[PDB]
Amino acid sequence: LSFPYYLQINFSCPGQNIEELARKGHLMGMKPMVQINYMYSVNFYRWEMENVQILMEAAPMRSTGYCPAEAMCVLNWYTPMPFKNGSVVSSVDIYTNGI
Amino acid sequence: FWTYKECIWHDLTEIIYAELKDEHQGLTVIDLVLTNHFLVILTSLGLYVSSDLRYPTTSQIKLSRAEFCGFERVDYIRGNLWYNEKCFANRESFEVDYVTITFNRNRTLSESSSCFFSKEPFLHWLPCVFSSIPRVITFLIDQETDSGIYLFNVQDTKETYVTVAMLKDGKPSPRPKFPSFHFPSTFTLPLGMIFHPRSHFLYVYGSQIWVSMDGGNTFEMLCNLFSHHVTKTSNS
Amino acid sequence: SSDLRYPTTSQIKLSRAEFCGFERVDYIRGNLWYNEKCFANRESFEVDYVTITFNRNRTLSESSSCFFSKEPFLHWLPCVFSSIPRVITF
Ligand SMILES: *[C@@H]1O[C@H](CO)[C@@H](O[C@@H]2O[C@H](CO)[C@@H](O[C@@H]3O[C@H](CO)[C@@H](O)[C@H](O)[C@@H]3O)[C@H](O)[C@H]2NC(C)=O)[C@H](O)[C@H]1NC(C)=O
Ligand SMILES: *[C@@H]1O[C@H](CO)[C@@H](O[C@@H]2O[C@H](CO)[C@@H](O[C@@H]3O[C@H](CO)[C@@H](O)[C@H](O)[C@@H]3O)[C@H](O)[C@H]2NC(C)=O)[C@H](O)[C@H]1NC(C)=O
Ligand SMILES: *[C@@H]1O[C@H](CO)[C@@H](O)[C@H](O)[C@H]1NC(C)=O
Ligand SMILES: *[C@@H]1O[C@H](CO)[C@@H](O)[C@H](O)[C@H]1NC(C)=O
């Protein structure tokens, strides 16, 4: 059974628009890499002190709509947003896969 | 070309004047390309393709003249041959060779098109665009992504743009792959585009010089030459 | 026309011949010559010919200004083969 909510990612860079930048990033092989860190609670009498990381890779996806072009259109990157029982604070670090 | 004494000069006029009924009048070379198995010569009196190069039979190249309906002598003097320089050494089964020819014309009742392309046995020359109108400066077949790239420039306007269209059964299609990239209005005149050999880099040149990574959805200017145009390019 | 003895669509279907280059200014100087002969019972040795004669020049795309074709008018071949005289009528 799934978590609610996804993380949706794009990037913006001055001088160009977002959609063609995402199209170029997909066409050149780039894929976001996401690292989630969870922070423990104050109540250590009810939860344990352990601190957890999870490393994921964002999946490309198309935006449903008119899409005049044949193949590619508005494009975004998506990953699930997981949360564990015992925390309310998570740090999400996004970086590139090198390509 | 390390010595001028070893560059041997040949005249081919007898072989050309064979295929042409009578005898016309100004057979200069206009362009020539050398594919992996073929020799394509565009001269002022027409376009000729060698039969093949891997099978010697008569110790003389036999050239077959292509058909173009009407195009006369004034249509061949303004004509360019575009070819992607790619080495097919061990010749995998999926690798083929294409050649594009581009004229500058008026649209007669006998033609319509001014841009043709053909596959490895250079016999069936079919048009590059199918069913005000833009003029195709350069059409290039890219095999990494199986697509065709057009460099359009509508006359009576400064508008210049590039369209990438998917290929269906070896023939380019309508409905571009991704929305076209429009160059700025300062781009005075384009003169062509080139693929760097054995690579996936695109280079549009003319009054300015632009480079594109990936397929050609996004470009980035690297040079501007006000009222000056590059005429030719050499790369290795 | 396609044919006249086999009606299919109650509308004449016309096919356009190929002539390489000839433009509009060469069709305005052109004549169709036909021998008026009645083939009623259609013996097997009787065929029909049509000649077309043009008043144009001699491009690198053609050479001839005189063509003739047989009863299915699809293959138009020149009337004279290999200063040069002009054929008014063949
Ligand atoms: C790249 O991602 C950003 C955010 O991750 C996207 O920006 C968001 O785009 C939407 C358009 O659907 C904006 O929504 C608009 O909001 C206003 C007010 O809520 C509403 O009146 C509009 O009708 C529309 O719904 C949203 O504000 C905007 N967010 C930010 C922070 O700019 C962007 O669209 C993505 N790029 C691509 C190419 O998908
Ligand atoms: C926070 O801790 C609670 C307590 O364990 C977690 O909730 C529990 O999750 C399990 C499995 O998802 C639930 O079991 C299932 O319940 C349904 C509903 O009756 C039943 O049909 C299934 O066969 C299965 O037994 C359990 O009910 C649920 N606890 C409560 C009180 O509803 C929760 O997942 C933890 N939070 C996170 C983010 O993991
Ligand atoms: C088209 O025709 C006009 C005049 O009819 C001529 O000036 C022009 O050069 C022609 N176009 C090309 C590409 O030559
Ligand atoms: C060839 O062109 C000339 C004018 O350029 C014209 O007088 C003549 O009619 C043409 N040739 C013939 C014999 O039809």
Side-chain angles (χ1 to χ4, degrees):
Chain A
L1 54 58
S2 81
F3 299 109
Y5 304 114
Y6 292 83
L7 296 175
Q8 147 185 322
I9 312 144
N10 51 19
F11 68 104
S12 93
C13 184
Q16 300 122 300
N17 45 84
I18 310 194
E19 37 202 83
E20 83 199 25
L21 278 190
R23 256 143 45 189
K24 145 184 183 183
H26 187 283
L27 289 175
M28 291 181 21
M30 161 179 86
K31 208 156 290 319
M33 298 210 82
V34 179
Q35 190 154 322
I36 296 194
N37 278 232
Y38 301 97
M39 179 55 95
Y40 57 86
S41 181
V42 278
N43 206 358
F44 58 90
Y45 291 98
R46 197 171 184 168
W47 316 97
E48 264 200 346
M49 182 145 278
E50 97 272 5
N51 38 67
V52 189
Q53 291 186 338
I54 175 149
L55 171 83
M56 307 183 257
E57 185 157 343
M61 208 203 138
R62 259 189 305 233
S63 149
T64 49
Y66 177 43
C67 206
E70 220 168 41
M72 222 165 288
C73 278
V74 186
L75 151 74
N76 264 282
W77 278 280
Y78 293 88
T79 185
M81 185 37 211
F83 53 93
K84 67 161 177 71
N85 204 326
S87 90
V88 281
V89 171
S90 42
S91 307
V92 170
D93 321 305
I94 315 176
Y95 56 109
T96 201
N97 70 289
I99 300 161
Chain B
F1 294 123
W2 270 100
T3 319
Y4 197 78
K5 299 317 155 157
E6 63 101 28
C7 189
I8 181 57
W9 293 102
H10 316 260
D11 160 85
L12 293 90
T13 323
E14 45 263 13
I15 320 166
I16 320 278
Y17 254 136
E19 223 273 342
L20 257 51
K21 333 186 90 273
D22 34 61
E23 275 232 2
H24 308 82
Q25 68 250 11
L27 72 161
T28 74
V29 162
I30 301 303
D31 216 302
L32 65 148
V33 295
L34 186 58
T35 321
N36 305 278
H37 300 320
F38 297 94
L39 209 179
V40 194
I41 289 159
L42 167 58
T43 202
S44 194
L45 292 196
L47 178 71
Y48 302 83
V49 186
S50 88
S51 84
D52 200 298
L53 295 187
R54 281 180 324 206
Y55 309 130
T57 48
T58 43
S59 157
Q60 189 125 335
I61 41 183
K62 36 177 317 299
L63 303 147
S64 312
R65 153 155 153 89
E67 63 99 41
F68 286 118
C69 262
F71 296 26
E72 334 241 301
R73 208 203 85 117
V74 307
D75 314 88
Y76 299 116
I77 43 150
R78 304 140 61 207
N80 314 282
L81 286 165
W82 317 103
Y83 167 64
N84 266 4
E85 176 148 326
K86 213 158 293 183
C87 177
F88 296 144
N90 297 323
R91 191 54 91 154
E92 315 285 343
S93 89
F94 48 85
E95 289 155 342
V96 281
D97 262 323
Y98 289 85
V99 159
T100 315
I101 178 146
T102 297
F103 308 91
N104 228 345
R105 280 187 96 262
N106 283 121
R107 90 157 4 257
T108 174
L109 176 38
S110 343
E111 232 315 303
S112 288
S113 266
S114 322
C115 170
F116 297 94
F117 81 104
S118 159
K119 227 195 316 294
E120 174 85 299
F122 299 100
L123 307 180
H124 191 220
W125 293 82
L126 56 147
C128 75
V129 72
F130 291 89
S131 55
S132 153
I133 220 174
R135 179 176 84 82
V136 202
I137 284 94
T138 295
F139 170 78
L140 273 187
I141 295 277
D142 81 278
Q143 301 106 325
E144 303 223 21
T145 316
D146 174 12
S147 300
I149 308 127
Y150 305 83
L151 174 59
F152 287 124
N153 162 245
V154 52
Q155 65 270 67
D156 298 54
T157 324
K158 306 305 290 157
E159 164 171 339
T160 319
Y161 61 111
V162 170
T163 306
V164 184
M166 292 180 60
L167 252 66
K168 307 307 162 43
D169 61 276
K171 210 203 59 61
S173 44
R175 288 203 46 84
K177 208 188 175 207
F178 30 76
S180 313
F181 183 73
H182 297 260
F183 288 110
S185 40
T186 84
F187 203 170
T188 316
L189 62 136
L191 286 190
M193 88 210 313
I194 44 184
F195 265 111
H196 182 69
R198 315 180 204 200
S199 39
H200 206 226
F201 293 121
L202 218 30
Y203 277 86
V204 173
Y205 58 92
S207 97
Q208 320 165 340
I209 293 160
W210 293 64
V211 62
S212 175
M213 264 74 92
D214 71 78
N217 87 305
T218 316
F219 285 71
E220 180 73 281
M221 161 155 88
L222 81 92
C223 188
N224 202 337
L225 308 175
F226 295 77
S227 78
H228 276 275
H229 37 280
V230 293
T231 39
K232 66 211 90 155
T233 315
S234 168
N235 37 18
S236 79
Chain C
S1 90
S2 90
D3 199 300
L4 299 194
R5 279 178 322 198
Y6 309 129
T8 315
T9 51
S10 160
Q11 187 118 336
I12 35 173
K13 176 76 140 201
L14 296 148
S15 305
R16 153 155 153 89
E18 63 99 41
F19 286 118
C20 262
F22 296 26
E23 328 233 311
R24 204 200 82 120
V25 314
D26 315 87
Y27 295 121
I28 54 149
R29 334 171 71 190
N31 304 275
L32 286 167
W33 316 99
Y34 169 63
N35 259 5
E36 181 145 328
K37 215 149 291 185
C38 174
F39 298 138
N41 294 323
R42 193 50 85 156
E43 316 282 343
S44 92
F45 46 81
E46 288 158 342
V47 279
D48 262 325
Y49 290 90
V50 156
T51 313
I52 176 142
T53 299
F54 319 76
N55 190 349
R56 3 151 57 252
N57 286 95
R58 227 167 177 270
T59 174
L60 176 38
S61 343
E62 232 315 303
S63 288
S64 266
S65 317
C66 174
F67 297 95
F68 84 103
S69 163
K70 226 192 313 295
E71 174 88 298
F73 299 96
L74 296 177
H75 188 222
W76 291 85
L77 59 150
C79 76
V80 56
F81 298 90
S82 53
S83 155
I84 288 327
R86 183 179 87 81
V87 195
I88 291 101
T89 292
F90 170 79

